[PDB]
Amino acid sequence: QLREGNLFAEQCPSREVLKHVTSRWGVLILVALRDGTHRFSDLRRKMGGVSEKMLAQSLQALEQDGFLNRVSYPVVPPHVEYSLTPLGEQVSDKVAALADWIELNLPQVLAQRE
């Protein structure tokens, strides 16, 4: 279906894309790669609290969405490296503006919760 999405529609696939890019690991992946290529072990390092499995699972959902390049190096020690595609750069700009806004306006939000 080559339509534009409608998030208000029950079962539009944009809801899935939205979930992938704003899940707690998807956001961190997308913000981190703005700095450049990272190996699996570099992401896993910055993101305290993520298991291997859940990281593999976000990285995979983001790659099949078209946001990441994944390059294998079977050479010893083996690594897999990740970077953003041009499409992935766009969404990442949107995710980062939001993440930044939140980090910056947190004290007013916390001062609200009482």
Place this chain on the structure above:
Amino acid sequence: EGNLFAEQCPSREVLKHVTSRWGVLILVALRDGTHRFSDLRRKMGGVSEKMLAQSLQALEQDGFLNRVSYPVVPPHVEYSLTPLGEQVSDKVAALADWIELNLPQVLAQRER
């Protein structure tokens, strides 16, 4: 200031709230103006009363929403964006719109 990379940062909770499926829809719908609970509910395909009530409570406790109760019979409740909710909403709506706009390219990468 927040740090989303740190496992215990409250920025993660607020992020969860503005970025949930229902939270995104509430923040985008209210950009049109004040809505009743029932008008939100009819726009958001698949939402339960419980889930709609839960996201609205979280967005109001964060400072993003005004709630006005009309206890007259039949009772109703109205929501609008605070100035602060207008600001997160802009960033949320820009993200919602990019995703919907670029959905065709995403689906094309899925089939490959």
